[PDB]
């Protein structure tokens, strides 16, 4: 009875803020080749978010320290090297997640909701990669992010309700991708507004199980629009 144990251990790790442990546990679960449950896939999501999220925070800090170093080329240089250390960890983490998605998650996703979840995730991890991408490789990586997000989008527009949290979350992140990665604030804004308006239009589609999350994500969409609009 290992899979249950791994999930138990993952939750224990999460409570102890030991995210590397959590993700390792969840990676094993995945690699067993059986389709993840909603709980399992969300645990995986969070674990890897925290793992990669640490390196992103760190990358930010060091990048900014490295750029505010008007002089002191030896400091700056050292900062650059450290930044490169962090970038490598991040790519490795990203590549690990991507590989799980490509090999295990996406292939076994038998329902549109799972398919969208994992495709969104693929878009996200490629997006993270694009943030630290070397000039010559950036375009391909950006394209892969966009392609993933696009496929998920298409699927969600077709198979899911506009109030579905996963559909809403995808719009949230895809819009951010446009804003932050493709430097298209207008499209970023358009995609986000469209999604919010569609959800609002079909407010009767909200379900017992999902209505807290739908509304919560709608507020997030509005948050981004307000920050970009003003």
């Amino acid at each position: 009875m290992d899979k249950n144990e791994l999930v138990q251990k993952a939750k224990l790790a999460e409570q102890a803020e030991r995210y590397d442990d959590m993700a390792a546990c969840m990676k094993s679960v995945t690699e067993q080749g059986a389709e993840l449950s909603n709980e399992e896939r969300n645990l995986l999501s969070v674990a890897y978010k925290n793992v990669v999220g640490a390196r992103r925070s760190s990358w930010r800090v060091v990048s900014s320290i490295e750029q505010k170093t008007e002089g002191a080329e030896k400091k700056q240089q050292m900062a650059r090297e450290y930044r490169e250390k962090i970038e490598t960890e991040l790519r490795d983490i990203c590549n690990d997640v991507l590989s799980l998605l490509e090999k295990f998650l996406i292939p076994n996703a038998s329902q549109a909701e799972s398919k969208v979840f994992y495709l969104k995730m693929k878009g996200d991890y490629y997006r993270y990669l694009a943030e630290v991408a070397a000039g010559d490789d950036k375009k391909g990586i950006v394209d892969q992010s966009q392609q993933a997000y696009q496929e998920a989008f298409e699927i969600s527009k077709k198979e899911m309700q506009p109030t579905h949290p996963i559909r809403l979350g995808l719009a949230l992140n895809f819009s951010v991708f446009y804003y932050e990665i493709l430097n298209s604030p207008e499209k970023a804004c358009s995609l986000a507004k469209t999604a919010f308006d569609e959800a609002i239009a079909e407010l009767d589609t909200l379900s017992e199980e999902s209505y807290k999350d739908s509304t919560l994500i709608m507020q997030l969409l509005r948050d981004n629009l307000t920050l970009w609009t003003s």
């Binding site: 951010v176 994500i217 997030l220 948050d223 970009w228």
Partner: peptide
């Protein structure tokens, strides 16, 4: 940085 654009999932505070 100011107020940053939200993305999901969000980091544990």
């Amino acid at each position: 940085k100011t107020i940053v654009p939200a993305t999901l999932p969000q980091l544990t505070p």
